[PDB]
């Protein structure tokens, strides 16, 4: 099964984390953490701060390479580079609303592509991906050489968009505080 | 080949069967069992009251666990936790003209989805569900929350209708002995 | 796993069934089909008589072809004739003591041959067998051939003995009422 | 690669054969051969009358069972008893023009079937099928019990028609020496 | 590799635990986790107290099924119950020096059982075993009997010792804080 | 992942190659032979004369068999001849602009064929082909014959064209030093 | 089953071939050629003379490649330019006593080298091998290079030779009319 | 076969290199890439000075991570964070006789372990050895830590040494000049 052969990852990132704020009495990342467990064995936290708190939740933190690249790229290379798995799925922790059917349907739309991200019909979500490890050194190379944009890389890799247009809301991104209170039950 | 990859399951049920009453001779229950039989080589039976009828036709009895869960949901987790397979077909026991193709058209319209039900063109049946075992977990949890609706937990694992529309009639529910009667040969 | 990819059978046999006789309060043929079920999700009975009684344990029965072929060699060629597995362990009805490592071992110690039986350390047991359905049409040529030879053919089809003289008196075959009591508890 | 995972056969038929007359210079049942050998490594003849003369350019007789069942279906049962492999592409021996893309397109349409046919855009040709072994079990008890209509038993084991309805005039049957005139170069 | 296929599990137990108790400054069960990580991606704890204390680390805890079942086999129950994995390499929190290549060796010796576990020169160690999901029904239905003793489960299952014999004191077993000083830099 | 699983072919060429020109800087093989080496690990050039410049960025050179058949057919076979994969994506020297997709969306088009080749909306490109070896045999009696089509060759080994309609001028070739410029930036 | 994976070749050989003389009425090749289709499907005779006779009994012939290289080399080399399959188990025309067993033992045996051939306790019989596909292009090169020693050839390509003592009088070769009559019945 | 599926490496190594200086007339160097090469299909050259002169023989270079690492193990790393394998077999520039069973025989005594060395009778060549990439992180988190040693980390990583004890000077490393001419032709 899908389950035990993609490594989950929660984009947990930069360099407090927005994603720590409640929804629903819910830190927002744990939401998107637990949506990638109940489809996924192996969920894992990219994280560079608060490290204690995402770990006591009971998952493992990776924290970025010393290389020290910019963005959520550099957040994928260093997970590639510290898990062994062969396909991760990475998705930001601010998207909270994200489908029990996301790894099933990132995959069978892959058309044999090493990387595929979401489009949700209005606009492109390069970092809920599904990656394969193969791409690691591109990614490197990419990132070596100082670039930084995430869908460029992501089609310089031979990836595509996968369309989510049909799952209402499931990709609404808690930008900040107010947005959170359009959400709040 | 799926004949010898997925286990077959009648769901005869709860805690006489209307399914041991005979159409054209032969039980409701055993009109599904030979349907599955005929696209399975490993078929078992999941009752908890007339086990010796349904071992009497040489299938092996699955018995309800003993956490006294509620409905079909119960049943399904039952022999994901008695069987050793990886994929099980269930139906229940009084949908009798189930089509030589269920197994191969759920099985190929997965999508990489650990469920999938079938919907008739006019409504769904979702105990008549291809199900991954690597959703057991989640249905333990379901259950042990005290949660009893099946569609919402297919949901809820990722799982998704399967259209049978084209297969005409094939999915008749014999509620009774009245419904029976409008069908007797 | 091995459990879910070998097909047990009970060679119940011929043309009462001395395999009816219990041992300890259950039938010889049922301590070996319970050994099997142990180890092998999928367990079928070849029986030619008292087919009621067999599938009243809840497991299928397959008939001898109607080809009228002699012996032990007749009832293999029947079940790979009327079974989709690629692979078979077959054992006779009289060896209640058959261990719990028995298909294991057989597999483990094919030296990827089609077929291997059991030699106990005295002698060669060649209807205790793990069988690949690949030599059913030399079977089948066997058998027309007018040949019944069980050991003759094992070899012929590339065939080794495998062997079990640690496993303390696992292959002791009651052969009659009188051996039975050597052994009732 | 397909090209080593699927016997073909040649249905050569019945209990001269018209198949052994020329178009342009080949046997028409050579046609059907050479065509298959173009996209399938092993390729044996289904004939009980001019053993000699298929076995001659180099391939594999198989006889029908001892059974004396009738028509296409004996042949399918006698191929898949006396050979090993796991899938057979069939096709009679008149059919001259079958098109070089056959197994492919059978096999990707497959859609998990164990069993698919042409449909040619105006008719089936169920003796063009590819097969599963499989349904052996399904196919033996079917002849058992005295039928023989192709299409019903492929219907039954859970098959379907593969539109080939863009491959212009592949599929003519050269029925008697009359249509061959219409076809000869 | 294996590190992808078999997943971890500390045996952190019963119904303050010693395993809690630090060696060279590090808790002993985390000894154990450490290593089990170090060979494997994907480790969780069985533990039913402190659960935070074991979550904290970053790893998933797995609480005792309600079913209350005794001992180490219950927690292997548990742990199949909720974990998706077809592999667990269970160990004991109080074995702090099991070795770098303990999943290796076990999975190369397992000669196709469905469990295998440690014997280290001088005694078995039931609890440090690789164990595959087959035998998940075989277990449940060994403890609801109210059968407890584990060796004879894994050898009822078909599982056999594996040699560690040439691995000096890596299978110590750290009974008290008595044997810990005997241990400590 | 299908970068580790087909081998990349510049086909250099012929009996100066035009494909040593520079565009943008970059001699035109090479556009070629970097956008092969993003998406497969494994690339070689078809190269029989200049060997030591193709040689000198780090490439495998193949030299033509010495059979000396004609055209781009001889190359293909004998790169099948000389490299032990599966699988093979060849390619012009002379297509620079080939997408970063080219081998995912060809190989997931293949619908079972064992050879695609692009067309890119206006016409066949049917030297960008992706090919198993298993054509291999049929190539050499078809070029044994004194056959260089390469179309109607690979429409005789099953194969047929895949849409690259909306990969905008990807498939330009440049023909000559005058083209060359209409595409310098 | 290795039954379906590996092409048994004959190599009936050079440039009557003693191979056509009966040993107990059946000629020597025969008794080769029988004893391969009794553990392998797909067998293939390489000759180049006497075509037609080893066609008639039901098999491809493979003629040797134009390229006019010297010894049994050769054969195999064409051999695998002629056939799709990864693995061939040749044999010499004049050995009529193989085994039953020999594929599956050098298949077992192999211990991961894409070469094996037999020593029969006293001497090497380097045309008796199990060849993968993978050494074809070295093949090639060596026989270009104008070498022609077998067993060189094959410990170049990582092979070994694999004991066959305990199988008396396996490996007899039939030099000559002399030495047949020391056989004949 | 195993030829398409181990990534081949020469350790060229450090931060004239001896592995220039010819053997024979062929580059040190050069005797380990064209072993490696006749084993495996894709070999690559991790070197840090004179790339030209290696990428001049058709090899691809890959350079040490800009980490800055120390030793052999630098080289490891930077080999997999660059190329996609999962598996790889390094050997150092200074081992000309290297045997042609090197590949097969790391692979067939794996015995399940991560990485494998050769150990010649008299002493470890821990880089000569046989690597999964799954020990990626490890090595990683290893280096980073400050710590350099090569066979501490095989061993951590649950790695063992295999004979090579038969190959008779297939491990004499050419440290100098003058021990290069103990072997000048
Ligand atoms: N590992 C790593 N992740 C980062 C870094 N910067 C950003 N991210 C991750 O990239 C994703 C986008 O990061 P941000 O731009 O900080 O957050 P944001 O407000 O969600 O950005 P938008 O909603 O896309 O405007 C998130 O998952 C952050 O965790 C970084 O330097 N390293
Ligand atoms: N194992 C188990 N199965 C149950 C239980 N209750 C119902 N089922 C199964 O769930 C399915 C629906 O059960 P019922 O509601 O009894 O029967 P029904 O009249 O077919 O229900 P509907 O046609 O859906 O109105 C059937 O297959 C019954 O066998 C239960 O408590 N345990
Ligand atoms: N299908 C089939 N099985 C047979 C037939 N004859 C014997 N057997 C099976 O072959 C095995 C040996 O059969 P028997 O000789 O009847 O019984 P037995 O007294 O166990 O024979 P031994 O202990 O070997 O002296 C048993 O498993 C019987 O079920 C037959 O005609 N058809
Ligand atoms: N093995 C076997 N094959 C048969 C038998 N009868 C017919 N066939 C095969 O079934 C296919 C149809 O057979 P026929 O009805 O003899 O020939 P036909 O004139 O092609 O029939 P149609 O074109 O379908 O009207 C052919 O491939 C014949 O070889 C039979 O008794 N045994
Ligand atoms: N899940 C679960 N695990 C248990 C239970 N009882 C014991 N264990 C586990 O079984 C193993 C042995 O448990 P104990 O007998 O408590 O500890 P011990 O002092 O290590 O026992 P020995 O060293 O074998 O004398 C340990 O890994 C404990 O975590 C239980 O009721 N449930
Ligand atoms: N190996 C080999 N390749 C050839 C031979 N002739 C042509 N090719 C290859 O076939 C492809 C077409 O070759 P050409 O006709 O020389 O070049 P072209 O001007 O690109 O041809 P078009 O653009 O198709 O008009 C190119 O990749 C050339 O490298 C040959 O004799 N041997
Ligand atoms: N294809 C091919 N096969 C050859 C050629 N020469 C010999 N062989 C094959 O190589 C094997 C040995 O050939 P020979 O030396 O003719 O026959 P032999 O008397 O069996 O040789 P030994 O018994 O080894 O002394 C046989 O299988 C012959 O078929 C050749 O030129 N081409
Ligand atoms: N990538 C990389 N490789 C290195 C480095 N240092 C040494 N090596 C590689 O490690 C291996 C041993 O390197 P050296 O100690 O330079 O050479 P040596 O004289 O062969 O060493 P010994 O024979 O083991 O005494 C060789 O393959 C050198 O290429 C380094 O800093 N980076
Ligand atoms: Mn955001
Ligand atoms: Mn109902
Ligand atoms: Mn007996
Ligand atoms: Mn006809
Ligand atoms: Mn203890
Ligand atoms: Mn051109
Ligand atoms: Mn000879
Ligand atoms: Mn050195
Ligand atoms: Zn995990
Ligand atoms: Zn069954
Ligand atoms: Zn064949
Ligand atoms: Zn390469």
Not at 80 to 103: N, R, V
Not at 134 to 153: D, H, K, S, T, W
Request: aromatic share 8%.
């Amino acid at each position: 099964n899908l389950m035990t052969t993609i490594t989950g990852v929660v984009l947990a990132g930069g360099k407090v984390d927005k994603g720590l704020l409640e929804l629903n009495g819910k830190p927002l990342w744990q939401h998107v953490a637990d949506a990638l467990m109940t489809q996924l064995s192996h969920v894992v936290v990219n994280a560079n701060r608060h490290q204690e708190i995402y770990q006591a939740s009971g998952l493992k933190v990776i924290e970025d390479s010393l290389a020290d690249y910019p963005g959520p790229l550099a957040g994928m290379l260093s997970v590639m580079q510290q898990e062994a798995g062969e396909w991760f799925l990475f998705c930001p922790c601010d998207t909270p609303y994200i489908p029990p059917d996301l790894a099933a349907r990132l995959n069978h739309q892959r058309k044999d592509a090493p990387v595929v991200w979401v489009h949700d019909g209005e606009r492109d979500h390069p970092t809920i991906a599904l990656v394969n490890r193969a791409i690691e050194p591109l990614l490197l190379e990419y990132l070596q050489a100082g670039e930084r944009r995430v869908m460029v890389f992501m089609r310089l890799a031979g990836g595509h968009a996968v369309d989510f247009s049909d799952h209402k809301d499931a990709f609404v991104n808690v930008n900040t505080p107010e947005e959170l209170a359009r959400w709040q039950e």
